[model samples]
Target: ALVKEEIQAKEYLENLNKELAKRTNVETEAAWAYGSNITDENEKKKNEISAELAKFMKEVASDTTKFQWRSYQSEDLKRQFKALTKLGYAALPEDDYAELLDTLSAMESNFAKVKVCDYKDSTKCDLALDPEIEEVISKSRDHEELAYYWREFYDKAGTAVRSQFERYVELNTKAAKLNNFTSGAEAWLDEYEDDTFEQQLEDIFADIRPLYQQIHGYVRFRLRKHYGDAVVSETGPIPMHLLGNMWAQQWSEIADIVSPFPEKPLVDVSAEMEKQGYTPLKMFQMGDDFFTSMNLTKLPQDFWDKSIIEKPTDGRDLVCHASAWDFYLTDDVRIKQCTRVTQDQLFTVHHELGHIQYFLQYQHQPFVYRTGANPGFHEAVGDVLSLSVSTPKHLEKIGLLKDYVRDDEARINQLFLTALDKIVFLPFAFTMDKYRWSLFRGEVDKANWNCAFWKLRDEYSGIEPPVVRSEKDFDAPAKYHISADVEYLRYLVSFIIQFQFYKSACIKAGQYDPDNVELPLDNCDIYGSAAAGAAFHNMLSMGASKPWPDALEAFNGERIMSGKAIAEYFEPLRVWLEAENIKNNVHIGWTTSNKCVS
Candidate 1:
């Protein structure tokens, strides 16, 4: 009887797997179509297929008890059962799920249509977020213009979607309960495959918070110097508008003012690339070559032939955000981006190609298992390469820089520029999900939504809105991730783990010695290390077949994620920052306050 029942269970799952692969392939293709060309028809098609997939997931989940997965002898079967049952929307009924999808689609549509207006003449309001007003925020030194754009964009983009967001929270909460989870946050956290993942996030933040504070204090001091004490307070939260980015997530735009040794500039890779007559195609080719140099698989011809590497010259309004896509069919991967011939976009090309490499490496896995060991692993893959790719030695080797300066002052400048984007972004990524988690967990009320958003932002990032805000503002939705309901913890974890990956790769590539400490973690490059590439491929090929820790261990022999690597990577910069902060008598942290809601 037991053998007969076990055989029946196996047969059922086998049939389900086959059906799932076919449907998942259809959904993936539909997603790619919608992403590459954002048309009403494409979106409708994508949604229809997605809804069907969700329904199938729900049906399978209903019979989860029929197969006692824990009692199964096969570990792989148990893992598949766990993955199949861990769905966010599968708990909802057909009508409720449809309503949830419609509400989310409406919120996203509203955010996409959002455009700020002329501050002086409200009637002449035709400013879009990307090139028009974002340019003003980045380039304009006028305090009033910065403040005006910040307020106008948030008021339109965030406040307008408040009710829709509320509905979303309610529906997500219902789905979570139906799935036997406590809250929507719990459902999202389940993907990490650890019960203590929430605490892990907090601990990771605690580890990196000190470094973030140092960067924050230094940036505040420099911005105060640039924009007078009247605009930037000495010991208070830095005004968000002056941070180059509208969200104040990264302070890279103000590198000119904040760099420690501005006179002794680092090599300008973008200018050199332009001088060398580099195009978008050339940048991608270089990225592909870097991977091949490591003995990793070359990008399939299908990638080169099918990818939309540049923005359309014809009249097609494509989604411009950079992303990598896998068709669930082997060797059918592609990337879509509006690639430009700039150093920043060059790094982005490498990042997307990193995603492609991971996809290709894991193509042999079943459709359900074809993902990173965890969300952060996928994000960290490209970043790991970018670390080496951005090093001074690598730049010179690639002929993007004429002479590589290895002086301490030059090193500090380069690291400082890198920190402006990487280290400074930690608290912002923390605050993004932290605030949403509160909303999903019912810890925050509707009336306190905007105030709570700013409170966390200021507490974590030491950034305050240019104008005083209140509950009416709904500032959280001003960020695209919040409106789109994308989980942000991946970025925070990815930032830390990439350094961990870099350190491990360095040791494997014979670029750094653990015992001697001759070369720093930041300066090590693994461009042509076949050994490092082989380990990376082995880890990627595991995909999501096992828990993330197993895959992580295969790559680095480390079972736990740690920020120690990141702290060590920026040790020289930290030393310099400590001396500078002491010399300038800069304050290291912001005082907690309800100042966000005036």
Candidate 2:
């Protein structure tokens, strides 16, 4: 009798989720590959399914059969209970509130399609440009050209997104209330186990910020010395665009400029791969070889056939950013990337393919268990793999380098290269969500939008605008994720989780030597080891069937998720950064209240 009930429920659940996944794939893939027209067609159908499922779930919530289902009091029945609970919270029947919220979601898609840049020569323009702009920025040492790009970041995307920003907040807050959450921010955060989500995040920021601040101080001093005071200032604030990326998130472009030994040419792996005449597909093939070497599953053959591997020159507004989707959670895993010959794309191939491996691993689990252990877990898996794939020793192993140096200064430059991305990103992640959290609680409103945005940016990230702003602009929503309603705390937490997972995997691979402080954690590789493979599969295959801590502890044996591993991974950078702060006499903490209080 128990087996019969389980079988019936499992059959129904798989049927429903398979249909749900199909519609989801159709809706998103259309929007991703093309632009907005066909998106609404599939989206309305998807919403209808979601609304219907929510109604069915609410009915099942109080049914006596549900009581029988819960009566089993065993492991298998408990998983079903977790699945039903996930579905109930994910979509709740709220009368006509469903259609209203659905309409608001469609409006956001329409507004996002509006592009403000119409420049003929994109390099001469200041908006989000073609690949040409990036090429120029990477190669150019001209300070004036860099300064102009810095100032006009918001003028294109932010200005176009302004009118819809307030409405997005208004409709979103209402949508949260429809589902019984206090605010949109709370609705987003409530997906986790605890109600103390805000406090937990605040505590993490305070704990990590001092260390991040020290790195920021050192990096700032380097910027001024190399770029000169004409462009950069060794002061409390700096213009961020001069940091190489338009987002000012990564500083890899300056690695050569800050190299302690310029005589040792920055090891040119990408240049070597180019000389070997590697194409876009060859990069992905290398990623597959690395995963298969670890005894992890390879990507489905269809993945390459359907993927948008390169940017379209057909004059379409294609979404060229990398993304992975599971068409039916079994056979149809896919990646959409505008692949290039640069080193960033090479790591990205490994990263996105990491998601594919995860998809293949958890294919048999029920829908709720078929995803990441937590929101951040999926993102972490890719990056955790990347730490190994990008190391100098592994590059040589892959035949990309003849010989790779392990000198202290060379190692420090490598450490700084990785930190330039992962560390600088922490504050940006914290501030982006902090603004939305405040807005959700009515702590600030439309009138104070730009004011509070820059204030939080300055306080948390220690970044101020290159120039003063006015009521005339909408700088905050300029970032697509904020307007699109993708919560950023997942990324902040993912960065920490990746290092923690990496630390454990490295130890299990038997490559780590505890007494040796000489080699950094970033330089370890677990590729091709059966022990590391088993450890990774053991955790990933559980998916979201267990709590995140349980999943983390299954392999790591330590349940707590903190920044300790990240600090340890970047220990060498930590010592170098702290000394740089003293040498320049720069402050080591934010001047204002870095934490936004309730």
Candidate 3:
């Protein structure tokens, strides 16, 4: 099953890549050829390429069902389906067809696989190590060292791929000129039914831009208060290195006050299953590491096996289990040696375990709706489970807060940090998206990319430092959404979606009584015991089979795109902001000061 799944996944990704590569090659060649002048030959070649792209798309779309049917799990099927949905866009050319194709091509090449030093071996590997210093170059120093390694990796893996992109852009500009458009952007828009890039930017500025600024301003206040007088400059808070120092200090103080406990929980919940006539699968703990260094595919073998299973059609044998990246659930000796554990580990375990339970419950459902609805829905499932950890009731369940009076100050701090992080992240996400767009537009030269990064740091995070920008910033290029050809907007969109799920789950579960909150004790009873969790899972299982707005509406119980939802959703943050002692230091919002076009 694993081999089949692996082969199918690789085949699907490769198939998409080939289509992307071929389209890019044709469009790029034609774009360069177009500059020679409009002629019968040029027109003939362009038409031929367009036809070929259409045929390729049709071929993939037709075979999508084959990929879907072979998948034993929803995630496997979803992966195949999403690959088709993303590639399907490449076939559409009623706008700047060439530029659009080039963008997709760039994304595929850039994001296909992220390469980084294996975190476990990074400190020791000679190739990635500094032999003279007898040390592996630290990734934390600046992104430069990591970025340098990334560049080398990409150069070896993507030389031909990049050449295709450059040619595509050059030829695309020429084709645009032939079509009477001044630039590729304009020409591309014409190809896409006159959807102007300028108009899109105007919409972004008018709508999302102010919110971005508001989020930035809100974060600056929180940082200034946290760091006090030491918070210097309007650009932002101190850099990550400094921030890490502050956080470590805070954690150190907290650790001193807190009592030590067992390395792993004493009770074996899975062992308890044997008493109930259930042969429980041994739980897999990812490791004690605060940071995950392994690829998603490289997680422990059991972790992958327990994650994907087929359900019966009758739904009588429903099974569910939660998988966690946040918590260390087992004393699995292998994981203990990997990394240091932390307080946040439980949060990760419970969250993923929530999903596992949800999936186990619906395992018997039809393949189409087996897992749940969409990615947002599943994320909400995990978030709600994690959110409960903050409640005293949850602590009591684990015997930590037995008859304990909940600390109001701690609750306030948690809420404040949560809101602050979300607000700060909004602009960061927006800026990252814009940065990728800039790269696609060729507006980000080496220097400009660094300047843009620093500017984003100031505007979104209120983090200003004298550190010089270098090639290091580009090392994790694959992390960007543009590199993967996925829209980064989803993260922002998911923020709202997650909140909606939270609201709905709370209502369905009947009041926020943390004490009575039911957890999936046994995978077999997951569906029967947890109505809210089941409903949440049902929502995410839809995958890409439905439109995003329609899927959201189905799960949210109403339309969510309206100003009312937006306002209400943001209301908690607003109220939290007003009540807290927040000091705004930087003037927030967009400025013409760093305008790239002018």
Candidate 4:
């Protein structure tokens, strides 16, 4: 609705100014605002005649209300108006500018009646199929069969969406070029006042390149150790066929292994939560709960039956349940789990649920900022919440840990592992970005792009899965991030920033409780207790009001340009490693021996 009003206002102003330009014998303005000269005094005067025109163009480009304009037809009209407004701003005379401002005021009143759609009649999205059949498929352990069904389902469901997205890109590119920009990339940078694309790319690579290399190598090493040398090779091409092979291996060894899923006492925990005024809807019940079985070559029955529900006292409801491919499709769970999944996947579950919790918390905020801004903010919420679960003090408070064992060595080891995961994530995130950019560039054909892209993935991520030898492995297609749309980097950056925030919070609170044992489970209390956490939340709460770099500084108490802070933050882990006799072992290095030989 807001978008329609803005569009209408723009149109009114454009038409009114066109007449005023003729009446005043002054040139009309172009509707679109382009270039970075808006701040220049000389340009401002030169464009003063078209000041109103320029205002409309700038509004279309930066206005949040414009984002709500759903109909592409309306957007097209706005784009035309924008171009006209920009021309007016650049070429109109002073007499015309005064008259144009009056015209704009009249148009604003005229556009006040534009209405918004109620979002009804939109396609309803549902993942459910035949309930009985879906239930059967959900519990099915035959991963090969599951993989086949999942592949078929994904192809059927995703084809139209993918086609439409491609069309959107084509249209956007054409529209951008028409405005004298080379592409949408250039236009976007102009809109944001960015100096150059190269600068942005350099910023990301210079800071994260090393971390990316380390993480990729770590994953490759782990894969080889568990699967064998044949599963992955450091020097050779990654067998595209072995992609799904790991699922088969897991089915053979761990799928039917009931002993790995340790049962937890959930009813008691629920009662305890209630006694403490938590209104807990559900508690963690078992370790290793397989939620989704979409592409896994092996999945046990009943993976989908489990769910974690939360009913807060404020009448908000949320549910966290497992899906076979849950970790494959969404950034909310996949990135967190990839970094760390506990025996029960409890941390992963809670971390993801924490995001949902925040959504419920701020749902009433201005719709634009309701869901929180950026993946970093959302991921930080989950990561911070997960920390609470890992702490012995938190465990004891919740009756999970019995005693306060000051295992400084274990604490240090855990911190190092945490840092290691973040470090490893650096390259994986970068590679994901690279692969997506590659897709956009058409470096590989669309049909075979997934398979070809995995080759690049292995090159950077070093995760040479054994299943890559067969066509089935290509089916993985980096599915979790394939649709993420430039958001993967958020996880890596968030993790790094969160560590700094966590450390700062500890310092302010006068204690180092990485395990979060002394905290309450209430969401607000948990978030409020940490000074850095609160600051981080504040940064996110700004939504798009501030740029990312500015937000980082606001939260980190300093600018992010200095790599020194991140390096210093990780020093504790290095010191801890020395204390645990694990010096030098922490570094990412090639594993010469292959474990997949078994």
Q: Per-candidate TM vs. native?
A: 0.94, 0.86, 0.49, 0.49
The C-alpha RMSD of each candidate to the native structure, in angstroms, is 2.2, 4.2, 15.2, 17.2
By lDDT, the best candidate is 1
Q: Candidate 2 lDDT, tens digit per residue, 1-598?
A: 7767766666656675565565556555544444312255555655565565556655544442454566454666566555555332334337544754465455445434443232245444323333644554566667666545544545655655666667667666765775567788887676565666567667766777777788777767777787787766555565656666656656677676765456664655778889888878899888888888888887777787777677665644444556777765456778777788877778888889878878888887766577777777788887877888778868778788775667777777777778877888888888888899898878896777777887877777777665667666667755657755678888888888888888888888876765766445767888887788787788888877887788888878877767888888788787886776677686554354222221
- Per residue, candidate 3 scores C-alpha lDDT tens digits across 99-167 of 555454444433322234544456542231111111222113333443345344434333424444344
RMSD of 3: 15.2
Q: What digit string (tens of lDDT, one per residue) describes model 1 on residues 1-598?
A: 5566667777777777777877888988887887677678887887788889898888788787788777877788778777778768757888888888777766666665567777777888767675568778777888889999998889887889898889999999999998789988888777788988878878878877888888899888988888999998887888889988889988877788888887776655877898999988998999999899899989998999999988776755455667888877768889988787776788889889989999999887866688889888898888888888888878988898785657888889889989998999898988888898899999986878888888988888888888878876788888878878888988888898888888888889988765665677777889999988988988999999899999999998889988888888888898899899999998888876445664
Q: Order of all candidates by lDDT, from best down to worst? A: 1, 2, 3, 4
* Model 4 TM-score relative to the real fold: 0.49
Candidate 4 structure lDDT: 0.39
lDDT, candidate 2, at 32: 45
Clashes, model 4: 45
Q: What is the lDDT of residue 76 in candidate 3?
A: 46
Query: How do the residues 1-598 of candidate 4 rate in per-residue lDDT, one tens digit apiece?
Result: 6656766765564565444334222211111110111223423443454554444444444542434344435543444434333322222234534543343322222121112211222253322222212332334444444444444333432232354345434544454554566654454344333365336545655765555444333333444444467545554433322322221111111212111111321111223344554322233322111111101111222222322233112422111122112211112111112111222245556555545444433433332233344456556655655554555445555564443443444444334434444554554555654655554444656666445545644555444433323322233322323322233545555555555555554554445544565431211113224454455455555543344466566665654433344555455554443433333243343432221221
Highest TM-score model number: 1
Model 4 poorest ten-residue lDDT run: 289-298
Off by over 4 Å in 2: 1-72, 75-130, 136-139, 150-153, 260-268, 517-520, 584-598
Worst 10-residue lDDT window for candidate 3 reads 331-340
Give candidate 3's whole-model lDDT: 0.40
